[PDB]
Write a protein that binds this ligand. Structure first.
Ligand SMILES: O=C(O)c1ccccc1O
Ligand SMILES: O=C(O)c1ccccc1O
Ligand SMILES: [Mg+2]
Ligand SMILES: [Mg+2]
Lengths: 408, 411
């Protein structure tokens, strides 16, 4: 039921308003051009806890515990539920969803593995209008702790060269001196970036926001698309510098090899769920501009096989190859061996599910805060040809996409 | 034309021998051989020919009514008029396109060789062999590949230095190996084929010029509105045991120099196809997998597209040719570097062989091939030179490739 219809550069500020006017209440914001989506409150929720041992459903009638033998079956059950079907669903998928779904052992973090929410209220910004439906920057030193990171990379490089795996994303968490103003970081960060999706979610005393550089996955009807980005240079100088960096990226043998290794894995992943011969690269290794950095990017698509749904596709595609590694399960393991803080939502997914689409954005270029931690996180794809010093610099170039725009 | 069908109760072992035995009987008549599995098409004589001379200044139609001079304002239009000729419609057409067709099309200045730029021929008689049946329509040289390796190395060095100066990104530098004698074509076909796994095989004789070879890649295939191109680039040997070969395969697939050399050419192929296709129809159906080609294995990708309404197979061919994998990047600068660096005309080397029928426009790249005319008898092979290339490796590469033809040349 459409409540109001008030008649674009005011979209940004309005969302902030909404987040503040109704702060300390649960909110989910998602940008998928030409629209913004803001959901508020909670009419139904599926919550999977940090170690994947409890699935909780909540709606107005109360709380239920659902059998959690398969998180994907829980997600399917939620989407088919009477309180849910026909409604837009805002979701989040933590990094360790992969290990849980994969029968890989893992150490649980603090954040949920998966949540899906039908909001009580919803604003939609489109065609210089909004539709309502109802029932002070901070300085961040991104060099600190550099040497420990380069050791982690040198370890990864040793493991690859020994043949333990081919690629792994090693990331570093940078703790922030104070909690940040999320609505103001959103506004200020956004104008600094050209992301494929933006998001801000506040739920159960935990907050995350970011400018997603790529899609994990998009499903429209029977067509599945994934969008691996891998291979990076800065775009942090004048146009001349940036354009020389673009040509350099296109012709650098290390960056190109990093890229193609991931596209070929993304092809094999889609092949596991798609009709034979339907998997094609629609865009091969073009440069994508993402704020402080520009990347090689490819679009791969296929047609889901008859016995495969968007959740089967999501479990194979998750996490992005470009945020985990190759082969995926060995990389996931190396990540849990090498990294010392839980990724939580970092390298996970933000979801928007509605009548026409399953949309899943990769969680990078993002900032996170709960009762215990406030941090940003960036990594780099490590291959046999990686240099620890260059990969450090790469994380810093990526961190410059979010870090300068953290408002206190 | 009158036709006859024969079932030969011949074992597989004897099929290739029978074909080259028939070729033997065509003695010194003009003829055209093309293998596109499951068939071998042999054409004999000439009923109708389009001839484009070496400098691209004269187009001639020839049939039983005599010679007619056509306007060379557009080779593509000439080729279109020939296909639409009453003499031609409904017949398989055997074509050859010389390296210099590129430069000419692109209004780049070239030095003409002696071979025609392009010819298309409807033969007078035809034989089609397919799995032991035939349909008729009627009315050991020793070659040292190391010799002169030093001169080639300097050509590679010069290309590399030119790339490092930013003149172009990639160029194929090739070397011609003069041969001691004229070769026996039917015996070369027979021995050379069973040692190769080419996309197409060919042999032609026309107006005192001959060529034969085992094409490793298809410039282009068009059936109806769908155009496929299959760029190959990046090489290792497969001259050893299956475990040596499997090692070389994994090594090819993960070598950053080879992977870059491959993808640079694929993206050029994609951009070329996009100029003549429906927006969004150009996709990569097969990304960078290993293809086995006799003495060598290569990375190949399969790219496809849907032709736009204002464009035909002739339009696709003009943009797709020569193979980026035979010229360079950017194409025009690479064609200029090849003309300044190489000392002999390529003629048909790195050109195309065409088989055109009702359904299809099939074009195979001329590499792994042998040429002979009134003046020269030679083989030829090159290598894709990028910033990372070393002259020693690239010489070795030309020799790995030459080994698909050199060992099988018969007198
Ligand atoms: O390492 C990269 O080049 C990269 C770029 C974009 C997204 C994820 C990545 O690992
Ligand atoms: O240089 C190569 O590896 C190559 C391989 C196949 C065809 C053309 C080529 O240049
Ligand atoms: Mg990288
Ligand atoms: Mg090569």
């Amino acid at each position: 039921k459409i409540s109001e219809f008030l008649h674009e550069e005011q979209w940004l500020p309005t969302i902030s308003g909404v987040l503040r006017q109704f702060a300390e209440e649960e909110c989910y914001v998602y940008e998928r051009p030409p629209c913004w989506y803001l959901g508020k409150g909670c009419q139904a929720r599926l919550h999977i806890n940090a170690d994947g041992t409890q699935a909780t459903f909540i709606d107005d009638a109360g709380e239920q515990k659902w059998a959690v033998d398969s998180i994907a079956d829980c997600a399917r059950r939620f989407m088919a539920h009477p309180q849910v079907k026909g409604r837009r669903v805002y979701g989040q998928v933590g990094f360790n969803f992969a290990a849980h779904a994969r029968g890989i052992a893992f150490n649980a973090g603090e954040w949920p593995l998966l949540t899906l929410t039908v909001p009580r209220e919803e604003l939609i910004f489109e065609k210089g209008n909004v539709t309502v439906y109802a029932d002070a920057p901070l300085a961040v030193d991104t060099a600190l702790n550099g040497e420990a990171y380069k050791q982690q990379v040198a370890r990864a490089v040793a493991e690859i060269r020994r043949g333990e795996y081919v690629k792994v994303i090693v990331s570093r968490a940078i703790p922030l001196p104070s909690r940040i103003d999320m609505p103001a970081t959103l506004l200020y960060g956004r104008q600094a970036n050209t992301p494929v999706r933006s998001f801000m979610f506040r739920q159960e005393g935990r907050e995350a926001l970011g400018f997603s550089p790529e899609l994990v996955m998009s499903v429209t009807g029977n067509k599945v698309v994934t969008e691996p980005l891998a291979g990076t240079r800065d775009r942090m100088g004048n146009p001349e510098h940036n354009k020389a960096k673009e040509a350099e990226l296109l012709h650098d043998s290390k960056e190109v090899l990093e890229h193609i290794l991931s596209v070929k894995e993304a092809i094999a992943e889609l092949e596991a769920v798609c009709l034979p011969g339907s998997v094609v690269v629609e865009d091969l290794m073009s440069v994508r501009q993402r704020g402080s950095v520009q990347h090689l990017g490819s679009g791969v698509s296929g047609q889901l096989a008859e016995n495969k749904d968007a959740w089967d596709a999501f479990t194979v595609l998750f996490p992005s190859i470009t945020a985990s590694g190759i082969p995926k399960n060995a990389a996931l393991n190396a990540i849990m061996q090498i990294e010392k803080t839980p990724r939580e939502l970092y390298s996970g997914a933000i979801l928007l599910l509605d009548d026409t689409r399953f949309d899943a954005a990769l969680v990078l270029r993002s900032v996170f805060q709960d009762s215990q931690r406030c941090w940003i996180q960036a990594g780099a794809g490590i291959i046999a040809q990686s240099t620890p010093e260059r990969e450090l610099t790469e994380t810093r170039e990526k961190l410059a996409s979010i870090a300068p725009y953290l408002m206190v």
